[PDB]
Each structure stands twice: as C-alpha cells, then as structure tokens.
CSV table of C-alpha atoms (C1' of nucleotides) and ligand atoms in Angstrom, one decimal:
chain,number,residue,atom,x,y,z
A,30,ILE,CA,-56.1,25.0,22.8
A,31,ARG,CA,-56.3,25.1,26.4
A,32,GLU,CA,-57.3,21.6,26.8
A,33,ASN,CA,-54.5,20.1,24.7
A,34,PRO,CA,-51.6,22.2,23.6
A,35,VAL,CA,-49.1,19.5,23.0
A,36,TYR,CA,-48.0,19.0,19.6
A,37,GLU,CA,-47.1,15.6,18.2
A,38,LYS,CA,-45.0,15.2,15.1
A,39,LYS,CA,-45.9,13.2,12.0
A,40,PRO,CA,-43.6,10.4,11.0
A,41,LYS,CA,-42.5,9.7,7.4
A,42,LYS,CA,-39.4,7.4,6.6
A,43,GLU,CA,-40.5,5.2,3.8
A,44,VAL,CA,-39.3,7.7,1.1
A,45,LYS,CA,-36.9,6.6,-1.7
A,46,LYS,CA,-33.9,8.8,-2.1
A,47,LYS,CA,-34.8,10.5,-5.4
A,48,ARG,CA,-32.9,13.5,-6.4
A,49,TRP,CA,-34.9,16.4,-8.1
A,50,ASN,CA,-31.9,18.6,-8.8
A,51,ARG,CA,-29.3,18.5,-11.5
A,52,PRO,CA,-26.0,17.9,-10.0
A,53,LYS,CA,-23.0,20.2,-10.5
A,54,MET,CA,-21.0,19.3,-13.4
A,55,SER,CA,-17.2,18.2,-13.1
A,56,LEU,CA,-14.3,19.9,-14.5
A,57,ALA,CA,-13.6,17.0,-17.0
A,58,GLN,CA,-17.0,17.4,-18.2
A,59,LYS,CA,-16.8,21.2,-18.6
A,60,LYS,CA,-13.4,20.8,-20.4
A,61,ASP,CA,-14.9,18.2,-22.7
A,62,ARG,CA,-17.9,20.5,-23.3
A,63,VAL,CA,-15.5,23.4,-24.3
A,64,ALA,CA,-13.5,21.0,-26.6
A,65,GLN,CA,-16.6,19.8,-28.4
A,66,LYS,CA,-17.9,23.4,-28.9
A,67,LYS,CA,-14.4,24.3,-30.3
A,68,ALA,CA,-14.4,21.2,-32.6
A,69,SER,CA,-18.0,21.8,-33.9
A,70,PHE,CA,-17.1,25.5,-34.6
A,71,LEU,CA,-14.1,24.5,-36.6
A,72,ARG,CA,-16.1,21.9,-38.3
A,73,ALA,CA,-18.8,24.4,-39.3
A,74,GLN,CA,-16.1,26.6,-40.8
A,75,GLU,CA,-14.5,24.0,-42.9
A,76,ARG,CA,-17.9,23.0,-44.2
A,77,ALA,CA,-18.4,26.7,-44.8
B,4,G,C1',60.6,-16.2,39.1
B,5,G,C1',56.7,-17.0,42.0
B,6,C,C1',53.9,-20.0,45.9
B,7,C,C1',46.8,-22.1,44.8
B,8,G,C1',42.0,-21.7,43.0
B,9,G,C1',38.2,-18.6,40.2
B,10,G,C1',36.0,-16.2,36.4
B,11,C,C1',36.0,-12.9,31.2
B,12,C,C1',38.2,-12.6,26.5
B,13,A,C1',41.6,-14.7,22.2
B,14,C,C1',40.5,-20.5,19.4
B,15,C,C1',37.0,-24.9,17.6
B,16,C,C1',31.9,-26.5,17.5
B,17,C,C1',26.3,-24.9,18.2
B,18,U,C1',23.5,-21.3,19.9
B,19,C,C1',19.3,-17.3,21.9
B,20,C,C1',17.6,-12.4,21.6
B,21,C,C1',17.9,-7.4,20.2
B,22,A,C1',19.7,-3.1,17.3
B,23,C,C1',21.1,-1.0,12.6
B,24,G,C1',21.7,-1.4,7.1
B,25,G,C1',20.6,-4.3,2.4
B,26,C,C1',17.9,-7.9,-0.6
B,27,G,C1',13.9,-11.1,-1.7
B,28,C,C1',9.0,-13.3,-0.4
B,29,G,C1',4.1,-13.0,1.5
B,30,A,C1',-0.9,-10.7,3.9
B,31,C,C1',-3.2,-5.5,4.9
B,32,C,C1',-4.1,-0.2,3.9
B,33,G,C1',-3.5,4.2,0.8
B,34,C,C1',-2.3,6.0,-4.0
B,35,U,C1',-4.4,4.3,-10.9
B,36,C,C1',-1.3,3.8,-18.0
B,37,G,C1',-6.3,0.9,-18.0
B,38,G,C1',-10.4,-3.0,-19.2
B,39,G,C1',-16.5,-5.1,-18.2
B,40,G,C1',-21.4,-4.8,-17.4
B,41,C,C1',-26.6,1.2,-15.5
B,42,G,C1',-27.9,6.5,-14.3
B,43,G,C1',-27.3,11.5,-15.3
B,44,A,C1',-25.3,15.2,-18.6
B,45,C,C1',-22.4,17.3,-23.5
B,46,U,C1',-21.4,18.2,-28.8
B,47,G,C1',-23.7,21.7,-35.5
B,48,U,C1',-20.3,14.5,-37.3
B,49,C,C1',-27.1,13.7,-34.6
B,50,C,C1',-29.2,6.1,-38.4
B,51,C,C1',-28.0,2.2,-32.9
B,52,C,C1',-23.4,9.7,-34.6
B,53,A,C1',-19.8,10.9,-31.4
B,54,G,C1',-17.4,12.2,-26.6
B,55,U,C1',-17.4,13.2,-20.3
B,56,G,C1',-18.1,12.5,-15.2
B,57,C,C1',-20.8,9.8,-11.3
B,58,G,C1',-23.0,4.9,-7.9
B,59,C,C1',-22.1,-0.7,-6.8
B,60,C,C1',-19.3,-4.9,-8.0
B,61,C,C1',-15.5,-7.9,-11.1
B,62,C,C1',-10.2,-7.8,-13.4
B,63,G,C1',-4.9,-5.5,-14.9
B,64,G,C1',0.0,-2.7,-14.1
B,65,G,C1',3.1,0.2,-10.9
B,66,C,C1',4.2,3.3,-6.1
B,67,G,C1',4.5,4.0,-0.8
B,68,G,C1',3.2,3.0,4.5
B,69,G,C1',2.2,-0.2,8.8
B,70,U,C1',3.1,-6.0,8.9
B,71,C,C1',4.4,-11.7,16.2
B,72,G,C1',5.6,-10.2,9.5
B,73,C,C1',8.7,-14.3,7.2
B,74,G,C1',13.9,-15.6,5.4
B,75,C,C1',18.9,-14.5,3.6
B,76,C,C1',23.4,-11.2,3.9
B,77,G,C1',26.8,-7.6,6.7
B,78,U,C1',28.5,-5.4,11.8
B,79,C,C1',37.2,-5.9,15.0
B,80,G,C1',27.4,-4.2,16.7
B,81,G,C1',24.9,-4.8,21.7
B,82,G,C1',23.1,-8.2,25.4
B,83,C,C1',28.2,-6.7,33.2
B,84,C,C1',31.3,-9.6,25.0
B,85,C,C1',23.2,-13.8,26.4
C,25,MG,MG1,29.7,-14.6,28.0
RNA sequence: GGCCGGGCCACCCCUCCCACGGCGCGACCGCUCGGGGCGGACUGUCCCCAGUGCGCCCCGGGCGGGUCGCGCCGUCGGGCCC
C-alpha cells in the first residue's frame, strides 16, 4: 500500500446496448388493454 | 405685362430599387386521415386468433414558419417624386 497507492481504472467499452428491463407502457397500450379486457368480459357474459 | 437662363412636377416612351397588401410557383424546416417491410408488450375469439406502442428507412394527403426566394397584380406609395 505504501509503495503503490495509485488506482488505475479498468476499461470496458465493447458492450452491446442490451436492455434488461421492461420499458414503461404507453397510454395507447394501456387504453387498448382496458378495451380488450372489457370486450373479453362482455364476451364471457354473452357466452354465459 | 415683363426684360434671360436653370432645375422639379403635370404628358408620351422605357426604367432601377425599396416598402406594404394579394395571388401563384418552387426548395427547406416543423406539424400527420394514412400505407410497407423487425423488436417488445396486451386480450377469456388463442390454428399462422385478434388488437397496441416503439427503433431505422421507403411512400401518401393537408397545415404553418423562415426562403438572394421566384413571377404577376394594386398603391393620386417612397426613393430631396431614383
Ligand atoms: Mg426625378
């Protein structure tokens, strides 16, 4: 430690831009999901 | 009544720039009632069923803003009335 305290960083740049997280859904997607759920529920009733 | 010369305007021609307004034609930018091809995600129609955004590029219609913009039209317009 006394002889060499200097820190050198480790380089890493050859990384592809991969996303591991689900992106936030859009307003159009949420509205469509609500519409599909309503349609499916009405369909289930009319099948009875 | 003047007594000689100058300009400027009224007139004919042809002639430049600018301003303002209108119309049309480009090129650029921004703003989509939409069409093609891959990546996620959604629905109780789940047999290649259905529907929604997103990333790149290619087409289609309309709108506005800048454009030495470019032409045309108008001004008892302006340029010491070029
Ligand atoms: Mg003159």
